């Protein structure tokens, strides 16, 4: 058996401009086993409004997932990716960093 902790990257499809329609992405990669919970949060609240995702498997025993939703960024809204996985002692919350 193998367990691997997920890598989590949160990023917008295009550079973020307030009031411009866009896509927010969570790429959750390199995790094992596949059991996982992933959500995008808008100021702490689960974004339900359509969710697309994409799962894949690499033969070194690792799963890869792209999770994304349409969003119009504003100055005041905070976004984060919330991930739970058995390798984590607590749910992991990774904030979207608009600038870096």
Residue numbers in the entry: 0 to 99
Give excerpts from the publication.
By calculating the change in the protein intrinsic score upon all the possible single mutations at these seven sites, we suggest that the V85E β 2m variant should reduce the wild-type aggregation propensity, while two alternative specific mutations in the W60G β 2m variant (W60G-Y63W and W60G-N83V) are expected to weakly (the former) or largely (the latter) increase the W60G aggregation propensity. Indeed, the score of V85E β 2m is lower than that of W60G, the one of W60G-N83V is comparable to that of the wild-type while W60G-Y63W is slightly larger than that of W60G. In particular, for the crystal structures here reported of the W60G-Y63W and V85E mutants a closed AB loop conformation was observed; by contrast, the wild-type β 2m, W60G and W60G-N83V 3D structures exhibit an open AB loop conformation. The comparison of the wild-type β 2m and the V85E mutant structures reveals that the mutation does not elicit local rearrangements in the FG loop where E85 is located, nor in the surrounding residues. The 3D-structure of V85E mutant displays modified conformations in the DE and C’D loops; however, given that both regions are far from the mutation site, these differences may be due to the specific crystal packing. Upon V85E mutation, the wild-type β 2m stability was slightly impaired, with a Tm value decreased by about 3 °C relative to wild-type β 2m.
To determine the molecular origins of these processes, we compare here wild type β 2m and its W60G mutant, to investigate the correlation of thermodynamic stability and conformational flexibility versus aggregation propensity. β 2m is a single-domain protein, characterized by a seven-stranded β -sandwich fold typical of the immunoglobulin domain family; β -strands within the protein are named from A to G. β 2m is the light chain of the major histocompatibility complex (MHC) class I121314. While β 2m is highly stabilized by the interactions within the MHC class I15, when β 2m is released as a monomer, it may turn into the etiological agent of dialysis-related amyloidosis, a condition triggered by renal impairment and the subsequent chronic accumulation of abnormally high concentrations of β 2m in body fluids. β 2m deposits in joints, bones and muscles, lead to movement impairment, bones fragility and articular pain1617. The introduction in the DE loop of a residue endowed with higher conformational freedom, such as Gly, relieves the local conformational strain and results in a β 2m variant thermodynamically more stable in solution, with a decreased aggregation propensity. The three β 2m surface mutants that we rationally designed (V85E, W60G-N83V, W60G-Y63W) were produced as recombinant proteins, purified to homogeneity, crystallized, and their structures determined at high resolution (1.75 Å, 1.49 Å, 1.70 Å, for V85E, W60G-Y63W, and W60G-N83V, respectively).
